[PDB]
């Protein structure tokens, strides 16, 4: 009978998932633990509310950011 009770709880958790790692980013600084969990939450959020936009911008960029992190991690490698 209720999808809606849970339905937008996703949309709610979407932000919640979105916030956490994103918030952790405003907390942690950033590292290799961020990358999975942030991608976790967002990819999770990506599941939760599929049509909830900016995680599409975020998790995408976020992976790409992680990619950049690694590529800067690489610039701690191709440097060092």
Give me the DSSP letters along the chain: --SHHHHHHHHHHHHHHHHHHHHHHHHH---TTHHHHHHHHHHHHHHHTTT--THHHHHHHHHHHHHHHHHHHHTTTT--
What method was applied to determine this entry? cryo-EM
Are the beta carbons of 49 and 11 closer than 8 angstroms?
A: yes
Binding-site members are 15
Token readout for 79 is 């440097």
Separation in Å, CA 60 to CA 2, 4, 38, 45, 66: 31, 27, 11, 12, 10
Instruction: Locate 39 and state its tokens.
Output: 């991608």
Annotated binding site for 1D-myo-inositol hexakisphosphate: 15
């Amino acid at each position: 009978e209720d999808q809606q009770h849970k339905q937008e709880l996703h949309k709610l958790m979407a932000r919640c998932f979105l916030k956490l790692g994103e918030w952790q980013l405003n907390l942690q600084g950033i590292n290799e633990s961020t990358i999975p969990k942030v991608l976790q939450y967002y990819s999770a959020a990506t599941e939760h509310d599929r049509s909830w936009y900016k995680a599409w911008h975020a998790w995408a960029v976020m992976n790409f950011e992680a990619v950049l992190h690694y590529k800067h991690q690489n610039q701690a490698r191709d440097e060092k």
